[PDB]
UniProtKB/Swiss-Prot annotation, chain B:
<dbReference type="InterPro" id="IPR051253">
    <property type="entry name" value="11-beta-HSD"/>
</dbReference>
<comment type="function">
    <text>Controls the reversible conversion of biologically active glucocorticoids such as cortisone to cortisol, and 11-dehydrocorticosterone to corticosterone in the presence of NADP(H). Participates in the corticosteroid receptor-mediated anti-inflammatory response, as well as metabolic and homeostatic processes. Plays a role in the secretion of aqueous humor in the eye, maintaining a normotensive, intraocular environment. Bidirectional in vitro, predominantly functions as a reductase in vivo, thereby increasing the concentration of active glucocorticoids.</text>
</comment>
<keyword id="KW-0256">Endoplasmic reticulum</keyword>
<keyword id="KW-0325">Glycoprotein</keyword>
<feature type="active site" description="Proton acceptor">
    <location>
        <position position="163"/>
    </location>
</feature>
<comment type="subunit">
    <text>Homodimer.</text>
</comment>
<comment type="pathway">
    <text>Steroid metabolism.</text>
</comment>
<keyword id="KW-0225">Disease variant</keyword>
<dbReference type="GO" id="GO:0047022">
    <property type="term" value="F:7-beta-hydroxysteroid dehydrogenase (NADP+) activity"/>
</dbReference>
<feature type="glycosylation site" description="N-linked (GlcNAc...) asparagine">
    <location>
        <position position="142"/>
    </location>
</feature>
<feature type="glycosylation site" description="N-linked (GlcNAc...) asparagine">
    <location>
        <position position="103"/>
    </location>
</feature>
<comment type="similarity">
    <text>Belongs to the short-chain dehydrogenases/reductases (SDR) family.</text>
</comment>
<dbReference type="GO" id="GO:0016020">
    <property type="term" value="C:membrane"/>
</dbReference>
<dbReference type="GO" id="GO:0030324">
    <property type="term" value="P:lung development"/>
</dbReference>
<dbReference type="GO" id="GO:0005789">
    <property type="term" value="C:endoplasmic reticulum membrane"/>
</dbReference>
<keyword id="KW-0472">Membrane</keyword>
<dbReference type="GO" id="GO:0050661">
    <property type="term" value="F:NADP binding"/>
</dbReference>
Length: 267, 261
């Protein structure tokens, strides 16, 4: 149910935002941009050193407030406790950016069922848990979920099966939740971010002698995600290219869903 | 260039506007809307008797001027001169609604080059003369050009082949000048209007024994043409089974041109 305005940094001033996987990469960048914009901000990841740093820049950059809570999203207790603790810290919640992911490498699949389950737990199941926990507050602010996904979450890829599965799962889970929200008269927006290669310490570390693509700036990536969510869009596409950024849209799907939109009109 | 704005009937009034093939069906309706919204309206067609019917109903509906001219658009001399005459009769021009077509019926194309030629003359070539004559005045007003087309102008259908050819012609031509303008700083607006079956007499006689879904009303259609016309949209769809309205769109093509530009 996209917005009908144009983005302005002020849409975020005074907004209370959680960003996860917020200690390096895109997550960091989002915190900073929300900082420049004068938002309350709660950030998270496992290492508390690195998080402190981020919290510093954020306060220097302009945040109405800025905290951090360290912990693994491997553990679901923390996930549901983090949310309750963070909505306390800022006194309520406007947007929830689900961004974190478990350490992955590019490698062929030969029997790593530990990695597959782990991907599923951290990259997918935690999202749902956090969303469950944030939903009450989100309702009462008419906030917004943002979810960060990938090419590999829309099309297949050899080096990253466990990761793809997890990303694909988000699409299916949240898109199918997005429907429920419409009919539910639930006024919380769900934005899915599909990204091509992005220049992160980590991404490069894992691709820099295998993949040939040009990667996009982490800084701009982050802003497009904040905006997409601010403008309550359904998908955000971002890739150095524009060939790609136009293909991942799948209108067959737009249709079929529109069609099957009226195979039922019952509660 | 798009516009996320919204349509109020007031975007019109005071606007200088031509409506071709107004003597019947959708043309009549477009004008009757422009009259119930009151702009300057010069209206063409051949039938002089019916082009009077229309010219007066428009006054008694609130047009800030109604006049007719009566000729056959087969005549490229006439066409160029109609747009002069109407240019004078109005002191400028904002919106040109190319709509006229030529007598067709469903028929399996055997060997009738004649119908193919007339179709290209009246349905494609003339609209091109109308435009070229109109272009100075529309430059001076940052106006809009509205081209009316059809399903048969996007995808193949049997039985209307002369037709489709002239319709497809309109797309290649106008979408291609459209681009010429943008990458040029020329602020003229070109709308292609892709319309499924509509409920009009000459269009009902023709499709007689063809299992169509109900033709959507000439009125909202006419309105739709005018709306997106005014809204300066690149293209405008409209079909009764609004189903179609979805996949009639061709996203595949959008991608291509973006890159070549
Ligand atoms: N960069 C790209 O080319 C690209 C392309 C498509 C999609 N994406 C998506 O963008 C998002 C972020 O990616 P990125 O490139 O910024 O990667 P990144 O730099 O490696 O982000 C890692 C973040 O997640 C945290 N994290 C890792 N394991 C965790 C765990 N078990 N529990 C809680 N937090 C954990 C890390 O913190 P700690 O390790 O300190 O806990 C760090 O804050 C991901 O959703 C990714 O799929 C990126
Ligand atoms: N009706 C549909 O089912 C439908 C569906 C798809 C597309 N369309 C499109 O809608 C547009 C208008 O269709 P319509 O249904 O409104 O058609 P229509 O009812 O037959 O009207 C045709 C108009 O064109 C005029 N005309 C015929 N020959 C002419 C000529 N040689 N020079 C100048 N004007 C001439 C007629 O006036 P005179 O007889 O007085 O000359 C009449 O005003 C066309 O582009 C058509 O392709 C309609
Ligand atoms: C988490 C990780 O950083 C990652 C980055 C990028 C994507 S991607 O789906 O966007 C992507 C984009 C472009 C291309 C190309 N050529 C390939 C991919 C798959 C990955 F190699 C997936 C995952 C990594 F590298 F696996 F560790
Ligand atoms: C000019 C005319 O009125 C006309 C109307 C409709 C279209 S159409 O291409 O848009 C169309 C629309 C719906 C369906 C369906 N079912 C079929 C068609 C093709 C026609 F057989 C083409 C032309 C006619 F019929 F030829 F006189």
């Amino acid at each position: 149910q996209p917005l009908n305005e144009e983005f302005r940094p002020e849409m975020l001033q005074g907004k209370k935002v959680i960003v996860t996987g917020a200690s390096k990469g895109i997550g960091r960048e989002m915190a900073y941009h929300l900082a420049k914009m004068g938002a309350h901000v709660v950030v998270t990841a496992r290492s508390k050193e690195t998080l402190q740093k981020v919290v510093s820049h954020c306060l220097e950059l302009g945040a109405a407030s800025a905290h951090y809570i360290a912990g693994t999203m491997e553990d679901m207790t923390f996930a549901e406790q983090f949310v309750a603790q963070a909505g306390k810290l800022m006194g309520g919640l406007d947007m929830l950016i689900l961004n974190h992911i478990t350490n992955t490498s590019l490698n062929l699949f030969h029997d790593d069922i530990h990695h597959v389950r782990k991907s599923m737990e951290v990259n997918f199941l935690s999202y749902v848990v956090l969303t469950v926990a944030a939903l009450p507050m989100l309702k009462q602010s008419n906030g917004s979920i943002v979810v960060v996904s990938s090419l590999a979450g829309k099309v297949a890829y050899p080096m990253v099966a466990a990761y793809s599965a997890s990303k694909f799962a988000l699409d299916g889970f949240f898109s199918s939740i997005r429907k429920e929200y419409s009919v539910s008269r639930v006024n919380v927006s769900i934005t899915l971010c599909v990204l091509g290669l992005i220049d992160t310490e980590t991404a490069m570390k894992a691709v820099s002698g295998i993949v040939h693509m040009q990667a996009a700036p982490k800084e701009e990536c982050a802003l497009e995600i904040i905006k997409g969510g601010a403008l309550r869009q359904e998908e955000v596409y971002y890739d150095s290219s524009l060939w790609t950024t136009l293909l991942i849209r799948n209108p067959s799907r737009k249709i079929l869903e529109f069609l099957y939109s009226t195979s039922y009109n019952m509660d």
